[PDB]
Design a protein around this ligand. Structure first.
Ligand code: 8NQ
Length: 230
């Protein structure tokens, strides 16, 4: 997160760190007792390592009573995702067992009605992504509030030049932004999960290159089928 501040510890009990051999790769969001939602490109580099999900965390390194690193039984990238596109950029991770819930670990309700979040709406994004252009990794969870950017502006030649389909949404990126390592994390509006940070490479913090987030409501059939597949 660029331009953000350190989050209140455990104030976002849905927040997940998706890891490869104990290193943070991507954000994620606990959406059911046994399932974490993230972005499909997050496991690009994962084949020879172990994917895990850290729940209950504020610091990535320090001991906290609510922190628990779960193994992943199954990783289910969206079947229409492709390397080289950011369409269908969703991933569902089935934890080894149901997560232990409490005040610091709780699923986030997610948007099931397929209608646009209205523009200018202030949404929360949190993550352990990079905090400066040099690539510095924070140890603890950061967040920022970002206004939703209307799709027509996001589609202008100056911005993303018609790449923003109905299944994606944008947020402003003027200094305050999501960035590398925030990929897969949640964009929350009115206490409901609305978007998942995409996981393609991009500039961060440049107003003409808005952040792009996959609209969960657009994928409700897919999420529901996977979630039921246990
Ligand atoms: N939404 C964006 O702005 C964005 N998304 N990605 C993808 C990304 O982020 N990752 C891809 C999915 C894997 C793992 C992961 C990664 O490298 N993780 C990583 C690498 C170094 C430091 C930290 Br923290 N996380 C970017 C890459 C470059 C610049 C901006 C971004």
């Amino acid at each position: 997160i660029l331009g953000g501040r350190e989050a209140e510890a455990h104030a976002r009990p849905y927040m997940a760190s998706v890891q490869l051999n104990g290193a943070h790769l991507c954000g994620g969001v606990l959406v059911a007792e046994q399932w974490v939602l993230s972005a499909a490109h997050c496991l690009e580099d994962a084949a020879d390592g172990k994917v895990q999900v850290l729940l209950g965390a504020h610091s990535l390194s320090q001991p906290e009573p609510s922190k628990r690193l779960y193994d992943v039984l199954r990783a289910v990238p969206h079947p229409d995702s492709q390397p080289d596109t950011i369409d269908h950029d969703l991933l569902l991770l089935q934890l080894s067992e149901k997560a232990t819930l409490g005040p610091a670990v709780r699923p986030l309700p997610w948007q099931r009605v397929d209608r646009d979040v209205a523009p200018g709406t202030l949404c929360d994004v949190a993550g352990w992504g990079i905090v400066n252009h040099a690539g510095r990794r924070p140890d603890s969870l950061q967040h920022v509030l970002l206004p939703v950017l209307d799709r027509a502006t996001c589609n202008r030649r100056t911005h993303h030049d018609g790449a923003i389909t109905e299944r994606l949404m944008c947020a402003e990126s003027n200094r305050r932004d999501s960035c590398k390592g925030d990929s897969g994390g949640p964009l929350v509006c009115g206490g409901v999960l609305e978007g998942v940070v995409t996981s393609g490479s991009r500039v961060c913090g440049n107003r003409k290159k808005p952040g792009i987030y996959t609209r969960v409501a657009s994928y409700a059939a897919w999420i529901d089928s996977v979630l039921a597949s246990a």
